[model samples]
Target: MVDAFLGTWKLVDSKNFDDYMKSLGVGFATRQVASMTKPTTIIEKNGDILTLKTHSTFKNTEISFKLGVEFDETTADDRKVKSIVTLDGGKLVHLQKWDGQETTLVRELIDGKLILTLTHGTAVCTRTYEKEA
Candidate 1:
């Protein structure tokens, strides 16, 4: 269920994020700002719709959707993409496609921590988060 994901989560750690951005073709200036920015996420659910909102000093973004339905997404870097989300076991699996490129984002809870893995081709970035509120 999406209930487990409803909460405020603060980022605690990130690994290989820069390389992952490079794989995504994120600009150098945006990557610099992104690397230095610490973001918080608030996930909420209303019936079958799930909303994930991101907040940061650098930028804020949000997405709302139902599982297995594809939707248009405007990324933090302002890329317009087609995205879909599904629950695989207890993990939230997100897939995005744009301009013949694709990326994967998976979020799972483990040992009181939220683990997010972002993947693009051979590039991978791991981010860890903890409950904030």
Candidate 2:
């Protein structure tokens, strides 16, 4: 089930992750090191409540919320504020509401591959993780 993914997953590798970080305004030096750092993602789900945690040797980030609910988003790296996450057709969809319209970020799994899509930013970043036992 999709909810099964609601747990801690360790980052094994990433493809084009630097570009993704760059899009987020990460500096070159930090992105270089971050790209090589293996981050662990911890997710907890209870009913509609969801918690996501990302940890690495360099830094850590966490997010908690309920499905279909809108909330404020503050980046750990001092970025702008604006984002909400929801499930769309069994996919984790994040809507960044700022300025005027909403920008969407979709997360899904296909054939064991983790896929991430960012709509309105013209940037697509996908990273895969292995279930940690």
User: Which one is best on lDDT?
Assistant: 1
TM-score of each: 0.96, 0.82
List per-prediction Cα lDDT, in the order shown: 0.93, 0.71
* RMSD to true structure for each model, in Å: 0.9, 2.4
| TM-score, cand. 2 | 0.82
Candidate 1: C-alpha lDDT: 0.93
Number of backbone collisions per candidate: 0, 0
Clashing pairs in 1: none
Alpha carbon deviation, residue 83, candidate 2 (Å): 1.7
Model 2 segments more than 4 A misplaced: 99-104, 118-120
